[PDB]
Design an enzyme around this catalytic site. Structure first.
Site, PDB file in Angstrom:
ATOM      1  N   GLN A 116      57.415 -69.143  26.870  1.00  0.00           N
ATOM      2  CA  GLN A 116      58.527 -68.372  27.414  1.00  0.00           C
ATOM      3  C   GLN A 116      59.208 -67.576  26.311  1.00  0.00           C
ATOM      4  O   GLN A 116      59.189 -66.332  26.313  1.00  0.00           O
ATOM      5  CB  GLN A 116      59.522 -69.289  28.123  1.00  0.00           C
ATOM      6  CG  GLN A 116      60.614 -68.527  28.903  1.00  0.00           C
ATOM      7  CD  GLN A 116      61.572 -69.454  29.667  1.00  0.00           C
ATOM      8  OE1 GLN A 116      61.428 -70.678  29.618  1.00  0.00           O
ATOM      9  NE2 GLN A 116      62.559 -68.875  30.369  1.00  0.00           N
ATOM     10  N   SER A 174      54.537 -70.542  21.320  1.00  0.00           N
ATOM     11  CA  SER A 174      55.682 -71.411  21.147  1.00  0.00           C
ATOM     12  C   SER A 174      55.229 -72.832  21.380  1.00  0.00           C
ATOM     13  O   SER A 174      54.479 -73.097  22.320  1.00  0.00           O
ATOM     14  CB  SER A 174      56.784 -71.045  22.143  1.00  0.00           C
ATOM     15  OG  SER A 174      57.782 -72.046  22.230  1.00  0.00           O
ATOM     16  N   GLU A 217      44.763 -59.159   2.242  1.00  0.00           N
ATOM     17  CA  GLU A 217      45.193 -59.262   0.879  1.00  0.00           C
ATOM     18  C   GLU A 217      46.097 -60.462   0.739  1.00  0.00           C
ATOM     19  O   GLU A 217      45.881 -61.278  -0.151  1.00  0.00           O
ATOM     20  CB  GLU A 217      45.878 -57.966   0.458  1.00  0.00           C
ATOM     21  CG  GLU A 217      46.130 -57.804  -1.029  1.00  0.00           C
ATOM     22  CD  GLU A 217      46.688 -56.431  -1.345  1.00  0.00           C
ATOM     23  OE1 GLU A 217      46.960 -55.683  -0.384  1.00  0.00           O
ATOM     24  OE2 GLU A 217      46.836 -56.099  -2.540  1.00  0.00           O
ATOM     25  N   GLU A 235      52.982 -69.488  33.001  1.00  0.00           N
ATOM     26  CA  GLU A 235      54.282 -69.485  33.639  1.00  0.00           C
ATOM     27  C   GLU A 235      54.639 -68.020  33.940  1.00  0.00           C
ATOM     28  O   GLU A 235      55.319 -67.375  33.124  1.00  0.00           O
ATOM     29  CB  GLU A 235      55.310 -70.229  32.732  1.00  0.00           C
ATOM     30  CG  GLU A 235      55.308 -69.895  31.209  1.00  0.00           C
ATOM     31  CD  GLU A 235      56.047 -70.944  30.348  1.00  0.00           C
ATOM     32  OE1 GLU A 235      56.625 -71.888  30.914  1.00  0.00           O
ATOM     33  OE2 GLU A 235      56.009 -70.859  29.096  1.00  0.00           O
ATOM     34  N   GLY A 285      55.002 -74.182  27.504  1.00  0.00           N
ATOM     35  CA  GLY A 285      54.004 -75.137  27.044  1.00  0.00           C
ATOM     36  C   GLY A 285      52.640 -74.566  26.783  1.00  0.00           C
ATOM     37  O   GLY A 285      51.918 -75.030  25.888  1.00  0.00           O
ATOM     38  N   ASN A 298      65.208 -71.535  15.187  1.00  0.00           N
ATOM     39  CA  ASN A 298      66.187 -70.728  15.892  1.00  0.00           C
ATOM     40  C   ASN A 298      67.556 -70.908  15.291  1.00  0.00           C
ATOM     41  O   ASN A 298      68.287 -69.940  15.073  1.00  0.00           O
ATOM     42  CB  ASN A 298      66.218 -71.171  17.335  1.00  0.00           C
ATOM     43  CG  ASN A 298      64.864 -71.220  17.921  1.00  0.00           C
ATOM     44  OD1 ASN A 298      64.101 -70.264  17.850  1.00  0.00           O
ATOM     45  ND2 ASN A 298      64.501 -72.386  18.400  1.00  0.00           N
ATOM     46  N   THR A 308      64.460 -78.270  22.721  1.00  0.00           N
ATOM     47  CA  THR A 308      64.275 -77.822  24.089  1.00  0.00           C
ATOM     48  C   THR A 308      63.866 -78.950  25.021  1.00  0.00           C
ATOM     49  O   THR A 308      64.212 -78.916  26.205  1.00  0.00           O
ATOM     50  CB  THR A 308      63.203 -76.725  24.152  1.00  0.00           C
ATOM     51  OG1 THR A 308      63.577 -75.632  23.303  1.00  0.00           O
ATOM     52  CG2 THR A 308      63.050 -76.217  25.576  1.00  0.00           C
TER      53      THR A 308
END
Ligand SMILES: [Mg+2]
Ligand SMILES: [Mg+2]
Lengths: 429, 441, 441, 429
Positions: free
Chosen positions: C11, C140, C254, C71, C144, C206, C179
């Site tokens: 998400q 992420s 590189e 999702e 999931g 975050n 989360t």
């Protein structure tokens, strides 16, 4: 933000804070409805440290209602600015203390403290950097003190860092509005000497004297009186509420007022106090209001600086002036009557100024000095307690609450200990 | 190249700072937003504003100074005031709950709370600077952080750089006028922790500001506006050399171990003049000799400690404007001439001239009149120990009665800090006691 | 000639992608439909958009990136959003029923469901491309599929091409903010199946985005809009060389075995700056040294792992705009200068300059202020192992309690995958454990 | 499409879903007639996952009616929005269970299951990617549970991949609306612990407490109550119905909520809950609603988090805010009362947000956490079952259904096993 809260019980005190928040509303010029109708952001700048905005700008108090019978709740509930309130805080009782302080302290004391301390605690989370909170009751009964004793204990434990500036009504020596006063009083004052952070004396007869002589008024009520006192208690946070070339908060105040923590019973002076014609006799100067400042007749407490000695003295000035005057009168006065100035406290007078006076006036004065003249106060009340405690007069109303007498001894030799304590400090050099 | 930076603390202290940067910004006339009224021509020979006003890629020239104090109300007025284009957000660090004039609080208790932010800001500026000579630090033994938190401030900042100069402007408890009574505690607790973290600093008392503004400025009813204006002038001239051409553009570091010959007793007086009215600006001439002879009037002494009761050590009469080496020079002979004055004879003369060619600029709305010549008598004598002695005797008894001690013991200081700090003023009393002794034979 | 392509999952992940292509399309200013505002002149010397925006026979220039996640709600918002002229239908592949944050589901269960469609799309683009260097893959450990299905994705895509670079942007479980709680399962199950299918990738957390946007962007109340904007900037600059002239237009390949010297511990930090406000854009100057010294502020560290607790290995401070080789260069001396910092000494210096001449472009409606110079500190140290250790200890106990295990065992994973994957972080703990050991004598 | 269905029996529950679909209609603003009268396609975007368009745009529910006597069928059949229904689903009984659960489970249980599971199955073919379906009855009798037990068994077998989120009414400890409750209940709960996928507790007394204290209402009925609960059960699919910067479905929920499949009895919190004046006391913040979230008084179930420990906790947020707040309050709270947070579940609080709140409000909160405090619930009901099962009180109504008692032992040591099971998980670290 050094914001604070209010909590009031007390047969009168519940009215007192009503007038108080009323006054503050005027000084913030926000409508009764709860939105601002004033003319400077300055009223909004520091508004929060008493008020609370609401969704939609409902501006609300950080007040806490104490009562053991809803009548007052209806009363102020019937109050102008009543729409400026939050219905949440209307925490009252179904019984009344009957002013047996044990009733309001164990019986109903333990009965309704919980809902209070909860919601109050919700206010505690509502406070970002809480400077404190303002309690109000009377020191002779239980309508305030009954529970307010429990408040000071509970929150005092619950917030050992917060300031507890306590105003409660003192029975005048002459007029006994009740005869159980020595007992409620003594039992309370045992607690308050331990737990309360600041206290200032609340006589009625002084307020009468002010209204009748110096106000030149014939018709005394409470409401005017609470005007006269919420004037001062409203002034106290001015710098804390508004800029000041010489600012000092309650921490700076008390720490700059008290030598030893047992001395937070303070007397009060506010002014000017005229009737209408007086201005056409006289005008306003800092030296003038100074010339009221050390007036026993403004000495709104049962203690006499003329008889006792200023352990401490201070001035709360709101207005726009020249401090070059202010100090000058300060030191001048600290000499002029040096004898009532305690000795080893050099510069026992201390200063302040708020860039704005209260509304309506151009300059403000406040005096919360602390002599030790109160010794006659405690000596009296303890004396009457002594007499009828020889008799056990109305012990039966009392022991019917299921206290012991030894507690009475505790606040007794207690309170005497505090008195003599003030004797040695007064009698020393 | 030649930088300094100002630090501001305590209620009166940042009051002073506000007056000051108002002043300098007026004096280079860079508009309050951060721009000059006009473009700056490229030239060389000496620095300019660059010392303090901060060059941007545009008309944004912010001071090189920092605000720190735990009583954050008033500073917001700067946060609101006209110079809200002038200053810069990260220039602003304040505490919410101040010390309550617990030295031990904003020094100990809240001392722990904002230090790192302060030091980071300092690193940003000094890293921004190159030839920063020294440190302008302002605070007050009243607005309590001015004592406590500043005490930690130099206590660590010195240990950070060291090699910078410590430019100390703080206020001293007026002799009989005051602000509180814990002032003994604030002061002396500061002092034993002040000295060894201080390089040199001057003691401004207010009552002189009053008496002299009222007589010499002809002031009827003054306040911190007038005071802050006055200290604004004095600091305005104490650093002109790094700002303006003068014949002997003496420097702070130059002042350091020469004005204060020994290491210890390294404070001083400062009676600026010529402060007069517009009606005394006319009806007068204001000679070099008038400013000069007038400079040593004990009644002109801008801190309430009688020079005539002390013996002078040094006098850095830095001058603004049309000064003549000769004329002043003979006036200095006149100062050798003064029978009433007596000097640390083992320092027979220690004089150090300052002749900066710009005469003073005046702040509109002010009370001082305009002149052609300025004096700063940064001078050091024996006299100033006495009022200290009042401080330690007052504090002596009050502390003997344990007054207020609960307040401080409650916040994490020990009693031997008190008695030992009294040993500190004991030693310094031995210092003003001894250095004033005339070397034998 | 020099292509890359982006893949988007989870998400938050495709949130990032949306922000990104919004960004680049803004930055080449090609209008959202697919046209540029004006005609494109024929020139040579380097590529342009052609990397990612896809040439048509007309004003239709679609990205070279792909959406994949099970999702499918939110992606429809792109299917609806303003760029519904921008993107292309076959660019869009989603799953209906996502993983429910079963790693094992969209990795195993629904893992089987959309893979082939994905690979066909990949073949269409890479076949459409020529000199595609590497692979931009976004997902992420939360949304999931971002863990599971991506895990298969690289697991096979690597085995498809191999020779392409793996450009890994995925989010890592914030240290104390989170989360869910199966995050241990998602992460570590990803990790043992992540590493040997990963080339190199960075870990964006975050909470740093919050703290820093709120202080440095002066943000009051942020969300994925601000976050996705911020990562939008960082990726915006991590590839400028292939988009814009810079002095040392370094390249991914590189970067690969030079930043991550060994094969194993091939992840890193990334603290971009200068993120400031419009009121700090003014009231500031934003020196190369300010971005540079500021670049190594541990408190500026854009992933919540203390650099000062680790020892740096490499730092590719690619720069946008008016950069000077010298000035930065001496700043790098300044970085050698930093006593607190400590480097994998057997790699004494491993630095690698990036000076791209375009300074940054800003996204309207954004909070970042405009500047002249950008930094990306893609740097690798010893520090980052610790938060991993938190992950394997948390997961250690929770897994010890068999929590949730029914969910995964229900979908076709075996227990030795769990304990063995814990051996995986065991080994990597030996890796950050060992490479940080200073080689003897 | 992750669309789902509803099935309701239950003396009340048949009413409950009536209110529920009623509410959803409001949130889709489609006329009672069955056509849309709203203002955003967003109501139409994901409309199908509850509704069903019809030829001509009759928009219809995916609901399934359970009843053993048509009165309810007439009742809701007499219902506003009643023209928004499909006459097909009006599957009821001619007898009524009499709430002997064996009656509604064997006797009438086996009697009318077939027509239901058929037509329901026709709905199963009507569902493209069925996320699930919503059952509703009560856990004390048979008017719902009688057959709903058979439903969960049959469809559970028939659809071993589908989610079964089950809400049924729990008998409050105080008021026994029937005395056969322990027996129906225990016999059911044996089944439900095995077969149901999600369950959340449905007390009445909590709903009273909400309406009377926190709603400040004097007149309780069902319908308002089902408003209060279908508020939450309506919120649950919001992200699943509407976008969300932080989305989580029932699979993400339960899988992100349950450690072991025996723990799908969850408690519920929804808010805000005021009476009209309250807004003029207070306003809305994420931290505010948070300050309700962990309120035992919103803890709408017979279990006390104040007594038990949060095995799990979660928040369902609908609105437009800053998650930077949201998380911050989250973690803040996960510390603030850490002790009622079970230990080895790190970050046992978990998050969500829906870009739109429910209609009428700007921000939404929902809490379906799972402590283990319910142990007193099962302990109680099992206890009463124990007493009269010592007596066999009303066994004759029971064995007249032709069950065995050993089944009663099965759900008995069964349910005790589940309780102690929660004991060890609660008593562990
Ligand atoms: Mg302060
Ligand atoms: Mg997904």
């Amino acid at each position: 933000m050094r914001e604070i809260v209010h909590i009031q019980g007390g047969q009168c005190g519940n009215q007192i804070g009503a007038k108080f928040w009323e006054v503050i509303s005027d000084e913030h010029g926000i409508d009764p409805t709860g939105t601002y109708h004033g003319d400077s952001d300055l009223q909004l700048e520091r508004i929060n440290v008493y008020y609370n905005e609401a969704t939609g700008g409902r501006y609300v108090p950080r007040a806490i209602l104490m009562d053991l019978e809803p009548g007052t709740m209806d009363s102020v509930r019937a109050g102008p600015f009543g729409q400026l309130f939050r219905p949440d805080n209307f925490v009252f009782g179904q019984t009344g203390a009957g002013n047996n302080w044990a009733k309001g302290h164990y019986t109903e004391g333990a009965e309704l403290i919980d809902s209070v301390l909860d919601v109050v605690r919700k206010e505690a989370e509502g406070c970002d950097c809480l400077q404190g909170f303002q309690i109000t009751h009377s020191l002779g009964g239980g309508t305030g003190s009954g529970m307010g004793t429990l408040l000071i204990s509970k929150v005092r434990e619950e917030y050992p860092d917060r300031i507890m500036e306590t105003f409660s009504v003192v029975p005048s020596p002459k007029v006994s509005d009740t005869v159980v006063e020595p007992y409620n009083a003594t039992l309370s004052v045992h607690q308050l000497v331990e737990n309360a952070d600041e206290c200032m004396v609340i006589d009625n007869e002084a307020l009468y004297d002010i209204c009748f002589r110096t106000l030149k008024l014939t018709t005394p009520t409470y409401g005017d009186l609470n005007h006269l006192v919420s004037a001062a208690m409203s002034g106290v946070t001015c710098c804390l509420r508004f800029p000041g070339q010489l600012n000092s908060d309650l921490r700076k105040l008390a720490v700059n007022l008290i030598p030893f923590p047992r001395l937070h019973f303070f007397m009060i002076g506010f002014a000017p106090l005229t009737s209408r014609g007086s201005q056409q006799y006289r005008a306003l100067t800092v030296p003038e209001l100074t010339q009221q400042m050390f007036d026993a007749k403004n000495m709104m407490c049962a203690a006499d600086p003329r008889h006792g000695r200023y352990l401490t003295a201070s001035a709360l000035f709101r207005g726009r002036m020249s401090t070059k005057e202010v100090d000058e009168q300060m030191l001048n006065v600290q000499n002029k009557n040096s004898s009532y100035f305690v000795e080893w406290i050099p510069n026992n007078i201390k200063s302040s100024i708020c860039d704005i006076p209260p509304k309506g006036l151009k300059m403000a004065v406040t005096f919360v000095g602390n002599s030790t003249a109160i010794q006659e106060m405690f000596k009296r009340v303890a004396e009457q307690f002594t007499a009828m405690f020889r008799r056990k007069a109305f012990l039966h109303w009392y022991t019917g609450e299921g206290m012991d007498e030894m507690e009475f001894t505790e606040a007794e030799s207690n309170m005497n200990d505090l008195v003599s304590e003030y004797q040695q400090y007064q009698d020393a050099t | 190249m030649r930088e300094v930076i100002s630090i501001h603390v305590g209620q009166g202290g940042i009051q002073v700072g506000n007056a000051c940067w108002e002043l300098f910004c007026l004096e280079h006339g860079i508009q309050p937003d951060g721009q000059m009224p006009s473009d700056k021509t490229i030239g060389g020979g000496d620095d300019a504003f660059n010392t303090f006003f901060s060059e941007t890629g545009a008309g944004k020239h912010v001071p090189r100074a920092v605000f720190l104090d735990l009583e954050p109300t008033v500073i917001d007025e700067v946060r609101t005031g006209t110079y809200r284009q002038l200053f810069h957000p990260e220039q602003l660090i304040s505490g919410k709950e101040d010390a309550a004039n617990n030295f031990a609080r904003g020094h100990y208790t809240i001392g722990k709370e904002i230090v790192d932010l302060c030091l980071d800001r300092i690193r940003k500026l000094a890293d921004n600077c190159t030839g920063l000579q020294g440190f302008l630090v302002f605070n007050s033994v009243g607005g309590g952080t001015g004592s406590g938190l500043g005490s930690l401030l130099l206590e660590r900042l010195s240990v950070d750089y060291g090699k910078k100069s410590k430019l100390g402007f703080t206020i001293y408890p007026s002799p009989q006028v005051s602000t509180a009574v814990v002032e003994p505690y604030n002061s002396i607790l500061s002092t034993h922790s002040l000295l060894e973290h201080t390089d040199v600093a001057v003691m401004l008392d207010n009552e002189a500001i009053y008496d002299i503004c009222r007589r010499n400025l002809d002031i009827e009813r003054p306040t911190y506006t007038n005071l802050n204006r006055l200290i604004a002038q004095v600091i305005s001239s104490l650093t002109a050399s790094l700002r303006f051409d003068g014949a002997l553009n003496v420097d702070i570091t130059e002042f350091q171990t020469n004005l204060v010959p020994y290491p210890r007793i390294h404070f001083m007086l400062s009676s600026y003049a010529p402060i007069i009215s517009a009606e005394k600006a006319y009806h007068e001439q204001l000679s070099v000799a008038e400013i000069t002879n007038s400079a040593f009037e004990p009644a002109n002494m801008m801190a309430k400690c009688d020079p005539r009761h002390g013996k002078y050590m040094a006098c850095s009469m830095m001058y603004r404007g049309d000064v003549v080496p000769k004329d002043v020079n003979a006036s200095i002979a006149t100062i050798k001439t003064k029978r009433t004055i007596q000097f640390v004879d083992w320092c027979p003369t220690g004089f150090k001239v300052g002749i900066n060619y710009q005469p003073p600029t005046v702040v509109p709305g002010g009370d001082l009149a305009k002149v052609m010549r300025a004096v700063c008598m940064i001078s050091n004598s024996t006299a100033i120990a006495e009022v200290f002695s009042r401080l330690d005797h007052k504090f002596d008894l009050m502390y003997a009665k344990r007054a207020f001690v609960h307040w401080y013991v409650g916040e994490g200081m020990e009693e031997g800090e008190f008695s030992e700090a009294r040993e500190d003023l004991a030693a310094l009393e031995k210092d003003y006691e001894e250095v004033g002794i005339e070397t034998a034979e």
